[PDB]
Design an enzyme around this catalytic site. Structure first.
Site, short mmCIF file in Angstrom:
data_model
loop_
_atom_site.label_atom_id
_atom_site.label_comp_id
_atom_site.label_asym_id
_atom_site.label_seq_id
_atom_site.Cartn_x
_atom_site.Cartn_y
_atom_site.Cartn_z
N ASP A 1 0.85 -1.23 0.00
CA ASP A 1 0.00 0.00 0.00
C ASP A 1 0.84 1.23 0.00
OD1 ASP A 1 -2.06 1.75 0.21
OD2 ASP A 1 -2.28 1.54 2.35
N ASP B 1 -1.53 5.51 -5.18
CA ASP B 1 -1.94 4.70 -3.97
C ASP B 1 -2.29 3.29 -4.43
OD1 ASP B 1 -3.16 3.53 -1.76
OD2 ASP B 1 -4.57 5.19 -1.47
#
Ligand SMILES: C[C@@H](NC(=O)c1cc(C(=O)N[C@@H](Cc2ccccc2)[C@@H](O)Cn2cccn2)cc(N(C)S(C)(=O)=O)c1)c1ccc(F)cc1
Ligand SMILES: [Cl-]
EC number: 3.4.23.46
Length: 374
Positions: free
Chosen positions: A37, A221
């Site tokens: 992430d 992201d």
């Protein structure tokens, strides 16, 4: 093959619910699957039974676990968890050949965070300390890796959609892209924040003021599935994509991600949907470049003789989020040492015989320093 060959193909994803890498924690070793992430900065692992986990970290069996005697809670846009901080030895068996002592949050309770069937049991937040919880004094994993070892301060991601891909840590592998890499500055080290300076739908400029595309930030992201756009930009972009795809009509809810549309297996009419380009600030004054994705990136399969899709551009109230929809088109280089992010066309991106994703430049764009939010 190239010198980073043993890190190629180190990522997996189960039905497209997050890309994860194996990480081995503690002593004797406990290996867990960890979602990559770049939108957060905590390294945290399931550490108690949950219905959606097959395995979890058992601190009492690791002789090298050290308790930091502090709780931690992290809320995301989707989901939240709570747990306990400590440190332990961590290595990535198909990553760099080093072992570091890193902070680790042991997740003991959570809400809507784990995803049934995703096969991942923790999260590796690769962004910077500014956004770590409880605060910026909790060193993130990649900062520990660079401070404790010789590994260069850069990593790169090739997320191969439909699921697998590669996380190359400490370098770039040239097999994973074609054409040239083009770089945009990291505006500020907190999220991987970038500046978007123009948006086109099939070649047609959306013509919003560039400050709208970065209100109140734009980030890259890998732990968010969609391309998320601020309200005024989303509304404008949908109007333009509808207009471009007008040889077929779809219900209004399809553009809201509330209805799916399905085609008989192998017949999806990709050609009727437009390409989408985002222009990013370049490394030289007044220069930009553009990355272009296909509907194979922004229409996502939902898993009969039917191919069902969800439209995966969505509305945000916290800025532009270039999630997996954008990243699956490209090899993305997070060059933290030179405070820049590179994009090249991915060697594994999904395309057809008529169109491919693209990274092109240079373009001339003036006044880009005004696009960012303050
Ligand atoms: C793992 C799966 N992810 C999702 O489903 C997903 C996650 C989030 C989200 O908050 N992500 C968190 C981390 C996290 C990871 C895992 C679970 C929860 C949260 C941070 O990245 C951003 N963050 C920091 C602070 C606040 N937010 C938001 C959304 N949407 C809101 S959406 C529907 O895309 O618009 C959808 C995935 C599936 C396929 C892929 F290719 C890639 C990812
Ligand atoms: Cl080439």
């Amino acid at each position: 093959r190239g010198s980073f060959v043993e890190m190629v193909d180190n990522l997996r994803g189960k039905s497209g619910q997050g890309y994860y890498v194996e990480m081995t924690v503690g002593s004797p070793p406990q290996t867990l699957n960890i979602l990559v992430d770049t939108g957060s900065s905590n390294f945290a692992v399931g550490a108690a039974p949950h219905p959606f986990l097959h395995r979890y970290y058992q601190r009492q069996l690791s002789s090298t676990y050290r308790d930091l005697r502090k709780g931690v809670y992290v809320p995301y846009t989707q989901g939240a968890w709570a747990g306990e901080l400590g440190t332990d030895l961590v290595s990535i068996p198909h990553g760099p050949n080093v072992t570091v002592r890193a902070n680790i949050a042991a997740i003991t309770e959570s809400d809507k965070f784990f995803i049934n069937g995703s096969n991942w049991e923790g999260i590796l937040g690769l962004a910077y300390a500014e956004i770590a919880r409880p605060d910026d004094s909790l060193e993130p994993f990649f900062d520990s890796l660079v401070k404790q070892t010789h590994v260069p301060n850069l990593f790169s991601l090739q997320l191969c959609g439909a699921v697998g891909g590669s996380m190359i840590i400490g370098g770039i592998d040239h097999s994973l892209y074609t054409g040239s890499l083009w770089y945009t500055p990291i505006r500020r080290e907190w999220y991987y924040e970038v500046i978007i300076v123009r948006v086109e739908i099939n070649g047609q400029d959306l013509k919003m003021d560039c400050k709208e595309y970065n209100y109140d930030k734009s980030i890259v992201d890998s732990g968010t599935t969609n391309l998320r756009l601020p309200k005024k930009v989303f509304e404008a972009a949908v109007k333009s994509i509808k207009a471009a795809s007008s040889t077929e009509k779809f219900p209004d809810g399809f553009w809201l991600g509330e209805q799916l549309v399905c085609w008989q297996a192998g017949t999806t009419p990709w050609n009727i949907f437009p390409v989408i380009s985002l222009y990013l600030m370049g490394e030289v004054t007044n220069q930009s470049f553009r990355i272009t994705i296909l509907p194979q990136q922004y229409l996502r399969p939902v898993e009969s003789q039917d191919d069902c899709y969800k439209f995966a551009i969505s509305q945000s109230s916290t800025g532009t989020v270039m999630g997996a929809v954008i990243m699956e088109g490209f090899y993305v280089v997070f060059d933290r040492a030179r405070k820049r992010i590179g994009f090249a066309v991915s060697a594994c991106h999904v395309h057809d015989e008529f169109r491919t994703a693209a990274v092109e430049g240079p373009f001339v764009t003036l006044d880009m320093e005004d696009c960012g939010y303050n």
